[PDB]
């Protein structure tokens, strides 16, 4: 562990425990000294080949202001360490959906999770960046009153610009080794494409599939290159089988994507809302994880 417990940063972020593994850095639990609430604190050693905390950083700070985004509390760099602190987000949409009786969300818990996923994918891709690495354990649901109905985005570490400066997109690089999960990966990435942002959709989209339905036919299955010669030759409408209707629309929109077009993120967003709007599904609703009603 690169800070043990009751270590303290700047004198005033206390490490309480780790929460988060060993890759590129890890992510600890820890006790603001000065608001006296509980922090999110992500280090990295100063000593590291591929240092991706700066990156992290630039991303969380672009993405201030807008919704499903932790509050950026600070950030440093030492002889021993960068760290930067944040605000702590509850329970993960990949153990929400475990702790579910089949292991499936309803629809109108998946429809709704659907639009606020789309949204915070909308808004990391307006900032010029692409998340690359959109799965249910990157999504985290609120843990205050004002924010236990609110889904936020998590992880920006394989996070990867793709607007320059002027707005200009990035030219491709001919071959990108693709290094995020497998089971939501897209195509284009198994196939070691640059990736766009039609990929984040993509992920999305198997995300709301295994939501709904529960699995993927691709799970359990560790190989890389055989998940992704099964999705290649997967009919995808076979996957929609128990889907609305209007997912062949958001399926036939991303299809037709390549790397230099911007989605139609409205197209997409009206699939779910029309999804709802057509099953009287509410915004109001108790989400499934939610007792009492």
Not at 199 to 225: C, H, N, T
Request: charged share 25%.
């Amino acid at each position: 562990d690169i800070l043990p417990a009751n270590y303290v940063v700047k004198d005033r972020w206390k490490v309480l425990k780790k929460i988060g593994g060993g890759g590129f850095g890890e992510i600890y639990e820890a006790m603001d000294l000065l608001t006296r609430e509980n922090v999110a604190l992500k280090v990295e050693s100063a000593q590291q080949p591929k240092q991706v905390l700066k990156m992290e950083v630039a991303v969380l700070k672009k993405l201030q202001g807008k919704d499903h985004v932790c509050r950026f509390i600070g950030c440093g760099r030492n002889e021993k360490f960068n760290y930067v602190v944040m605000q702590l987000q509850g329970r993960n949409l990949a153990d929400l959906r475990r702790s579910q009786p089949r292991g499936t969300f309803t629809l109108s818990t998946t429809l709704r999770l659907g639009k606020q996923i789309l949204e915070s994918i909308e808004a990391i891709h307006s900032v010029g960046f692409l998340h690359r690495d959109i799965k249910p354990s990157n999504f985290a649901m609120g843990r205050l009153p004002s924010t236990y109905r609110k889904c936020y985005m998590l992880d920006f570490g394989l996070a990867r610009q793709y607007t320059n400066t002027t707005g200009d997109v990035r030219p491709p690089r001919n071959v990108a080794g693709f290094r995020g999960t497998v089971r939501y990966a897209s195509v284009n990435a198994h196939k070691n494409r640059e990736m766009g942002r039609h990929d984040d959709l993509w992920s999305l989209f198997y995300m709301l599939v295994e939501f709904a339905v529960g699995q993927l036919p691709w799970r359990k299955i560790k190989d890389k290159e055989q998940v992704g010669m099964i999705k290649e030759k997967y009919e995808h409408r076979m996957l929609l089988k128990h889907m609305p209707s209007e997912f062949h629309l958001f399926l036939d929109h991303i299809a037709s994507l390549d790397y230099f077009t911007k989605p139609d993120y409205q197209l997409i967003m009206s699939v779910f809302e029309n999804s709802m709007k057509e099953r009287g599904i509410a915004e109001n609703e108790a989400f499934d994880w939610e007792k009492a009603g």
